[PDB]
């Protein structure tokens, strides 16, 4: 069981064109309720979404907190911004997802043997910092630009035991499946 399942649901990444993106859920939001089901951990949200979809629920409420940053003068005593949303429940029977990801650091857990990854020398245990110049804070951010770049080189920045190293890769299609891939195992 992954570590994030016991952590509070703090959105680390929102998938484009997803239910969460269309409704306006943003990184930094904390999901605290959905119909009902209290949401304290990522495990609660996963179990609630499964039970809701199996019960045929197509729409329900989603309670969300939006906090963070330095308070503006005079507003430090304000109550927490709690948002009441009406959400579309994803159809888990058809594999649909809500579209949010946890804040798991993009640390590579393994590299496939022979795949153009050890080509430029990315090893297991590396930490991805920036790609294509843009800073990123989660793994799913990298997978988005891989299947959108369309083959062109993606410049990556990597930290290893203190040193910061720059690697560049270019590979693309695959015969068995048919999509752009690199060859990395998350941890």
């Amino acid at each position, epitope marked *: 069981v992954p570590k994030y399942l016991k952590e509070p649901v703090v959105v680390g990444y929102v998938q484009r064109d997803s239910i969460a993106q269309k409704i306006g859920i943003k990184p930094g939001d904390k999901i605290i309720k959905i119909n009902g089901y209290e949401v304290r951990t990522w495990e609660d949200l996963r179990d609630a979404l499964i039970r809701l979809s199996l019960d045929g629920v197509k729409e329900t409420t989603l309670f969300l907190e939006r906090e963070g*940053g*330095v308070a*503006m*003068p*005079g507003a*430090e*005593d*304000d*109550v927490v*911004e709690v948002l009441h949303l009406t959400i579309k429940v994803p159809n888990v029977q058809k594999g649909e997802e809500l579209g949010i990801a946890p804040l798991v650091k993009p640390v590579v857990g393994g590299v496939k043997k022979g795949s153009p990854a050890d080509q430029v020398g990315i090893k297991p245990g590396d930490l991805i910092l920036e790609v294509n110049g843009k800073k990123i804070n989660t793994w799913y951010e990298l997978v988005e630009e891989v299947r959108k770049s369309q083959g062109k080189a993606i410049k990556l920045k990597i930290l290893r035991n203190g040193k910061m190293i720059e690697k560049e890769l270019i590979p693309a299609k695959d015969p068995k499946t048919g999509t752009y891939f690199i060859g990395l195992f998350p941890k």
Partner: antibody, heavy 118, light 110 residues
Framework: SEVQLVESGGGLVQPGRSLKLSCAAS????????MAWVRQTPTKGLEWIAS????????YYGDSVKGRFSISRDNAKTTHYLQMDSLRSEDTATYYC??????????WGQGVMVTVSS | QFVLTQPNSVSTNLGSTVKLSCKRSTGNIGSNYVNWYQQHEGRSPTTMIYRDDKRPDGVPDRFSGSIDRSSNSALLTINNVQTEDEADYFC????????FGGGTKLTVLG
């Protein structure tokens, strides 16, 4: 949204005299949010004047205010106030009351005109 | 303690994409949230963007906020600029006090 902010108490005042603005709030729990006053002129634009905390215990003021204005609030009558003393002709502006949401003003009033002239 | 500098006026055409800039004089722009307000003629300001890039309910998807710590500037981007977007836009931030930008009068031609 159900938040409503309605200013009153504006108008004309001779220079050096006093004027107290009111902002009646409804549609939300008044004591749960800090209030503020922002004024506007066609020349100076938007300029923050005063800010008071949700409970009414801390006050903050802009640079153009030097002990002249006193922002208060009545959490029982869902109304906050801006007492203005020693008004100069340069204080002529449209005065908005505003509600805060931690890091910004989420809703503004309708604005009331205050003209300082003899 | 610091000021926010916006262009006095910006002219764009219908259906185009406009970038309203808000520059922080001193300090890091990421250290405090940047908020954007729209004010039509003779009307009260309404929130377009809060917390750097959050868009309230009812605001069209055409509006979007961003932060560029390289130039220490905040940018309000309006895709497919319509005629109703012709208004004043004020950026807003804070620290020990509360600071408003000078405002940009957006003119929509075409």
């Amino acid at each position: 949204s159900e938040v409503q902010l309605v200013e009153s108490g504006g108008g004309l005042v001779q220079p050096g005299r006093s004027l107290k603005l009111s902002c009646a709030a409804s549609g939300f729990t008044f004591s749960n949010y800090g209030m503020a006053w922002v004024r506007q002129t066609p020349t100076k634009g938007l300029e923050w004047i005063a800010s008071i905390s949700a409970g009414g215990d801390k006050t903050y003021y802009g640079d153009s205010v030097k002990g002249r204005f006193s922002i208060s609030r009545d959490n029982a009558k869902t109304t906050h106030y801006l007492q203005m003393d020693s008004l100069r002709s340069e204080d002529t502006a449209t005065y908005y009351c505003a509600k805060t949401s931690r890091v910004y003003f989420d809703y503004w009033g309708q604005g009331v005109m205050v003209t300082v002239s003899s | 303690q610091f000021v926010l500098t916006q262009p006095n006026s910006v002219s764009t055409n219908l259906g185009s994409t406009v970038k309203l800039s808000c520059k922080r004089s001193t300090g890091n722009i990421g250290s405090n949230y940047v908020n954007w307000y729209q004010q039509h003629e003779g009307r009260s300001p309404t929130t377009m963007i809060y917390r750097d890039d959050k868009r309230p309910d009812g605001v069209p998807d055409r509006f979007s906020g961003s932060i560029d710590r390289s130039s220490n500037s905040a940018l309000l981007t309006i895709n497919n600029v319509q005629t109703e977007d012709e208004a004043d836009y004020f950026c807003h931030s804070y620290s020990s006090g509360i600071v408003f930008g000078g405002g940009t009068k957006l003119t929509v031609l075409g």
